Amino acid sequence: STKNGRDSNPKMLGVKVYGGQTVTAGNIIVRQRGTEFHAGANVGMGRDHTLFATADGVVKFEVKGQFGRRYVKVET
Amino acid sequence: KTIKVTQTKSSSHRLKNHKLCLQGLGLRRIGHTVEVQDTPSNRGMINKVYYMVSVEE
RNA sequence: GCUGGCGACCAUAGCAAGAGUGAACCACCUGAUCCCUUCCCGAACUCAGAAGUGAAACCUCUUAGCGCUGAUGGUAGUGUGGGAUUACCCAUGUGAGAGUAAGUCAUCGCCAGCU
RNA sequence: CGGAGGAGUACGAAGGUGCGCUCAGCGUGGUCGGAAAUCACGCGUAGAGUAUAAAGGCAAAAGCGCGCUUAACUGCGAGACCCACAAGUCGAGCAGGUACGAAAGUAGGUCUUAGUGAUCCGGUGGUUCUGUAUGGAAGGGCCAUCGCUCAACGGAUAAAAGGUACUCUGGGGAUAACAGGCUGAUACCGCCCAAGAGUUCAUAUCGACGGCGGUGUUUGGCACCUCGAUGUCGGCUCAUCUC
RNA sequence: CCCCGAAAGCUAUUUAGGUAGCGCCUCGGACGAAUACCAUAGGGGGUAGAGCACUGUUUCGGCACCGAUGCAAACUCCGAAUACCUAUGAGUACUAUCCGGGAGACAGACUGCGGGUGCUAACGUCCGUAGUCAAGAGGAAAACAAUCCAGACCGCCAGCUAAGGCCCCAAAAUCAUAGUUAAGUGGGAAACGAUGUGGGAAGGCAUAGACAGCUAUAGUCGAGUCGGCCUGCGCGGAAGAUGUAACGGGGCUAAAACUAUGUGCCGAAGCUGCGGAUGUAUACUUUGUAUACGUGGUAGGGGAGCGUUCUGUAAGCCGAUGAAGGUGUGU
RNA sequence: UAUAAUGGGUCAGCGACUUAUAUUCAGUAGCGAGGUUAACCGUAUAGGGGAGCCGUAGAGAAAUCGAGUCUUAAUAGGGCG
Numbered sequence: 001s002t003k004n005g006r007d008s009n010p011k012m013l014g015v016k017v018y019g020g021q022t023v024t025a026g027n028i029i030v031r032q033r034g035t036e037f038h039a040g041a042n043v044g045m046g047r048d049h050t051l052f053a054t055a056d057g058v059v060k061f062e063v064k065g066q067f068g069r070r071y072v073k074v075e076t
Numbered sequence: 077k078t079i080k081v082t083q084t085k086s087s088s089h090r091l092k093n094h095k096l097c098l099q100g101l102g103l104r105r106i107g108h109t110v111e112v113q114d115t116p117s118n119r120g121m122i123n124k125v126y127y128m129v130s131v132e133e
Numbered sequence: 134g135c136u137g138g139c140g141a142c143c144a145u146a147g148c149a150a151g152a153g154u155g156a157a158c159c160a161c162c163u164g165a166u167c168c169c170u171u172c173c174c175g176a177a178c179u180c181a182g183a184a185g186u187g188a189a190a191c192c193u194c195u196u197a198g199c200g201c202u203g204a205u206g207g208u209a210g211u212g213u214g215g216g217a218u219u220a221c222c223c224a225u226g227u228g229a230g231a232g233u234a235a236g237u238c239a240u241c242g243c244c245a246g247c248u
Numbered sequence: 249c250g251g252a253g254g255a256g257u258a259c260g261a262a263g264g265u266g267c268g269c270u271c272a273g274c275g276u277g278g279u280c281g282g283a284a285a286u287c288a289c290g291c292g293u294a295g296a297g298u299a300u301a302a303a304g305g306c307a308a309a310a311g312c313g314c315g316c317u318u319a320a321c322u323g324c325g326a327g328a329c330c331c332a333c334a335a336g337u338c339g340a341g342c343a344g345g346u347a348c349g350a351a352a353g354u355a356g357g358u359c360u361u362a363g364u365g366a367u368c369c370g371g372u373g374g375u376u377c378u379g380u381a382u383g384g385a386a387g388g389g390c391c392a393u394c395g396c397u398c399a400a401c402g403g404a405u406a407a408a409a410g411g412u413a414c415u416c417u418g419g420g421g422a423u424a425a426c427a428g429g430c431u432g433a434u435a436c437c438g439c440c441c442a443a444g445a446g447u448u449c450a451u452a453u454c455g456a457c458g459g460c461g462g463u464g465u466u467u468g469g470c471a472c473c474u475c476g477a478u479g480u481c482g483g484c485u486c487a488u489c490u491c
Numbered sequence: 492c493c494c495c496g497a498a499a500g501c502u503a504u505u506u507a508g509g510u511a512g513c514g515c516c517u518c519g520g521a522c523g524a525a526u527a528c529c530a531u532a533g534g535g536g537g538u539a540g541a542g543c544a545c546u547g548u549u550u551c552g553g554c555a556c557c558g559a560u561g562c563a564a565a566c567u568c569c570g571a572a573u574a575c576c577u578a579u580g581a582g583u584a585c586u587a588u589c590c591g592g593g594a595g596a597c598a599g600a601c602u603g604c605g606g607g608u609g610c611u612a613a614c615g616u617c618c619g620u621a622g623u624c625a626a627g628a629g630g631a632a633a634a635c636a637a638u639c640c641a642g643a644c645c646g647c648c649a650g651c652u653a654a655g656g657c658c659c660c661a662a663a664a665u666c667a668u669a670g671u672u673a674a675g676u677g678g679g680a681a682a683c684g685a686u687g688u689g690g691g692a693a694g695g696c697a698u699a700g701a702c703a704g705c706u707a708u709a710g711u712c713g714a715g716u717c718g719g720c721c722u723g724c725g726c727g728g729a730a731g732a733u734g735u736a737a738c739g740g741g742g743c744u745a746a747a748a749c750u751a752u753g754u755g756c757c758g759a760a761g762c763u764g765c766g767g768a769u770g771u772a773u774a775c776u777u778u779g780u781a782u783a784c785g786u787g788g789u790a791g792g793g794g795a796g797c798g799u800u801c802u803g804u805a806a807g808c809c810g811a812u813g814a815a816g817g818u819g820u821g822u
Numbered sequence: 823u824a825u826a827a828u829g830g831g832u833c834a835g836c837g838a839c840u841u842a843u844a845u846u847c848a849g850u851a852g853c854g855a856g857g858u859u860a861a862c863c864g865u866a867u868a869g870g871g872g873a874g875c876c877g878u879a880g881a882g883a884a885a886u887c888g889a890g891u892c893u894u895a896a897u898a899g900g901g902c903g
Contacts, residue, residue, distance in 0.1 A: 001249075002249065002250080002251090003252090004249095004250070004251060004252065004253095005249075005250080006252095006253085006254090008361095008362085011330095011361075012329080012330060012331095013304095014535085014536090015534090015535050015536085015576090016328090016329070016576095017576085017577090018533080018534045018535060018575090018576050018577065019533060019534035019535075019576095019577085020532085020533040020534060020576090020577055020578070021533090021534085021576075021577050021578085022577090022578095023328095024326090024327065024328085025326070025327065025328095025340065025341095026326065026327030026328055026338090026339065026340065027327070027328055027329095028327090028328050028329050028337095028338065028339085030535095031329070031330095031337095031338090032304075032305090032360095033303070033304040033305075033360065033361060034303085034304035034305030034306085034359080034360075035304085035305055035306075035310095035359090036304070036305080037535095044339080044340065046337095046338050046339065047338080047339095047359095047360080048337080048338070048359090048360055048361075049304090049305080049359080049360065050329085050337085050338050050339085052327090052328075052338070052339065052340080053327090053328095053340095054339095054340055055340090059534090060533095060534095061534070061535070064142090064143090065142095065143075066142090066143050067143090067307090068143075070535095084653095085640095085653085086640080086641055086642080086653085086761080088641070088642060089622060089623080089641090090622095091213090091621075091622095092528095092621095093528070093529095094213090095528095096527070096528040096529095096584095097528060097529075098528095099527095099528075099583070099584060100527085100528045100529070100582075100583050100584075101528090101529095101582085101583070102582085102583050102584085104784085105761090105762075106641090106652095106653090106761065106762060107652095107761090107762050107763080108762095110583095112582070112583085113581070113582065115529095115530080115581060115582075116529085116530050116531080116581090117528095117529050117530045117531090117580080117581055117582070118529075118530090118581080118582065118583095119529085119530085120528095120529040120530055121528070121529050121530095121582095121583095122529095123225095123226090123529095124213080124528095124529080125213095126213085126214085126225085127213080127214045127215090128214090172313100172314090178268100209539095209540060209541080210539055210540050210541095210570105210571075210572075211539075211540095211571075211572040211573075212572060212573055212574100213573105219611085226572100227571090227572065227573100228571070228572075229539105229540075229541080229569095229570065229571060229572100230540075230541045230542070230569065230570065230571100231541075231542075231569100250607065250608070250617090251564085251565080251607100252565075295545095302565105322894105323893090323894060323895090323896095323898105323899095324893100324894090324898100324899065324900075325899070325900075326899095326900100331502105331513105332501085332502065332503090332511095332512040332513040332514095333502095333503095333511105333512065333513090341899105342898070342899070343894105343895095343896075343898070343899095344895080344896095376885105377883080377884050377885055377886100378883100378884065378885070389883060389884075390883065390884085400505085402503070402504080404505070419508105420508090421827090422508065422598065429614095430612100430613060430614065430615090431610105431612055431613045431614105431615090432610095432612070432613090433609100433610055433612075437730090438728100438729100438730090439681100439682085439683090439728075440682065440683055440684095440728105441682105441683095459682070459683105460681055460682040460683085460728105461680085461681055461682080461728095461729100462680090462681105462729085462730080463730080463731080464731095469609090469610105469612085469613080469615080470612105470613065470614100470615050470616090471615090472614075473825105473826095473827085474826090474827075476827105476828070476829090478826090488732105488733080489731095489732055489733070490730100490731045490732040491730075491731070491732090518848105519848085591847085591848105592846100592847060592848075593847105636823105
């Protein structure tokens with residue numbers, strides 16, 4: 001008899017809106033367990049590290065800063 | 077400015093996108109020949125199914 | 134042409150070693166009266182000041198020393214069609230990683246002082 | 249019925265806010281004191297820590313202290329994620345009342361993802377709802393909350409173990425025991441290399457450590473045929489083929 | 492008789508060969524480019540490969556470190572091709588979406604590619620992805636659901652081709668040009684063994700005389716010889732039970748075998764030709780007419796019909812100059 | 823599945839999606855902001871019989887309001903119309 005045989009339910013993480021798409025305020029952009037992407041301009045962060053848009057515009061990804069962090073922002 | 081395409085093999089067992097490329101060029105059966113505009117958009121469909129068409133350029 | 138502040142950028146821009154700067158600015162610097170301060174200490178924070186020094190520190194300059202960047206060519210992988218089954222070959226499209234040649238001791242913007 | 253680990257909790261501070269601080273390692277010296285207690289100074293460096301398993305993260309530190317406090321609030325909520333349903337997740341912003349800051353401001357529990365149980369039936373608090381002639385009341389409704397290892401965790405009842413060779417019916421070759429089939433781990437047979445044994449001499453005859461095949465006599469693996477029946481362990485009689 | 496046409500999945504279930512919601516089919520209504528194929532532009536990734544910067548593991552040196560050197564599903568300093576999301580655009584196509592009526596199905600199979608398990612066993616088992624069967628006929632593979640070619644409306648004693656073939660069974664080349672094989676290899680199988688033969692790149696010695704043999708390095712003779720590497724096709728290794736039985740058979744050796752090239756032909760229910768039928772759509776601005784695209788089908792859904800008995804129409808019409816029924820013939 | 827899986831020796835005759843009620847959808851006919859009677863009476867498929875049913879208005883648990891209503895301190899926001 002094996003001592004294995006368990007696993008957890010899926011969580012459906014990942015990027016929901018890619019670069020170049022238009023969003024409205026409140027749209028969820030990234031679902032993530034940790035902070036792989038950071039919040040840029042017009043982007044807010046939830047209590048579970050979810051990134052969402054706070055204004056209408058176009059999504060844009062970039063790499064910025066002295067630590068080389070990945071940022072996502074919304075251009076109005 | 078226009079080119080002639082002839083279907084030379086069957087399309088029954090091919091991939092779905094290959095069948096759709098044939099339908100988008102307008103070929104309907106073996107031996108069918110059509111005349112289409114010479115544009116990159118048409119050339120892409122032709123190049124995808126190169127192996128079962130003949131082009132009179 | 135120097136000094137200070139605030140940004141763009143985040144190593145071709147960083148570390149390391151060596152050398153300079155006191156007119157102004159900055160830095161150490163004097164003591165602790167009032168404001169304020171340390172689970173103790175005027176060491177840090179703070180106030181009241183210029184008798185000393187550019188020693189340290191911060192800046193600027195030089196160096197390929199460490200680091201970083203990096204081709205061209207080839208190789209591996211791979212979508213579609215065909216031929217084979219120890220995982221290859223042909224046609225067509227695509228194309229790394231490592232390594233080699235080589236490069237680098239940054240580049241810009243706003244304001245205020247001194248010549 | 250693949251390979252590995254965790255959960256059925258904890259905390260009125262381990263929550264909020266303002267201000268402040270950086271780990272771990274090694275090396276020198278310094279009483280007991282040393283491998284390793286505390287003190288001081290250096291070197292290189294995230295390898296420390298995050299209540300708890302791992303993963304994704306963590307400098308405006310999300311790590312570590314101090315003062316004051318209760319936003320671990322009420323009414324909501326544009327817009328999204330996920331999804332058979334029932335459920336689950338994120339959320340700017342608006343109104344009221346607060347806490348901490350000089351202030352711009354931050355706060356609708358804790359770095360996040362586990363710490364859970366539908367409906368029915370009852371219990372407790374409140375209520376400008378209803379009240380079987382009428383006025384009350386009993387009972388019911390609405391809002392808040394309590395009683396599940398219902399753990400077979402979408403939970404058949406408030407309440408439940410066994411025997412049948414004395415057996416019976418509806419079905420299945422959807423599924424086992426015999427024989428057939430596929431396979432060849434195992435079994436048997438053959439070959440390659442050759443330490444050595446053989447008074448000397450690998451190969452007269454054996455042959456260690458290793459390697460490559462053949463057959464379909466063994467023990468097995470699979471479940472393709474047969475369950476509206478292919479009905480046998482050995483003996484007797486009679487055989488036929490292989491090398 | 493005509494038209495369309497699935498599934499054997501997900502979730503839950505005292506559930507596992509039952510059922511329910513969703514996914515897949517069909518019919519009606521609304522509404523038309525909002526859809527798809529391809530091109531261009533924007534975007535995130537951590538797989539193949541690779542590497543040792545972390546976590547582990549590995550060999551040899553020097554003194555845990557230093558220099559070389561390997562490995563990894565639960566390692567990553569790196570990192571594709573494809574897939575996926577969005578926007579714009581030409582051309583082609585009854586595409587997409589919404590609201591309702593009716594379902595079936597929830598036992599799948601094989602083959603290729605990427606994998607877990609198993610022995611890198613099984614026509615084994617469990618996933619992802621594509622094709623075929625299921626529900627699909629025709630030609631080829633001797634026979635052979637799942638392989639290759641190809642999607643059957645009906646008729647023809649017409650033509651062209653696909654896979655595969657052209658000595659006879661049995662349709663078409665005893666075709667053409669160069670080579671290889673002697674094993675019936677072709678037409679079953681390994682490690683290993685061997686002067687079998689064809690081709691290629693080098694090397695050693697040699698007419699002051701090379702190899703072999705022979706006389707005691709010299710010597711008689713008279714040109715090549717010697718040992719390796721790469722490569723094409725062959726040989727041994729090779730034993731089974733009813734009957735040759737491991738080319739389908741006959742038979743085949745300057746092939747009727749293998750390699751390369753070329754010119755013709757055969758070959759399907761594919762395509763074309765002639766005649767006929769039918770579904771949908773667009774125009775004739777009734778038409779039943781032309782054009783265009785279609786017509787393989789299980790479970791299912793939709794449409795249109797033929798016959799049988801009885802009631803009205805029927806106190807009608809047919810009937811002993813012969814009804815119903817039975818048995819032939821023609822159409 | 824030719825299957826060595828099931829059923830049928832053969833012929834003739836018989837043999838399996840119905841009936842009643844309720845409900846929903848689609849065709850078709852009458853009337854139409856209206857439509858329609860049931861039991862019953864009736865020398866009776868006529869004619870009477872309007873009790874009742876469906877449609878015409880939602881919101882809210884309900885009292886209550888009503889083109890609005892519920893939640894709320896809120897005329898804010900939001901849900902159903």
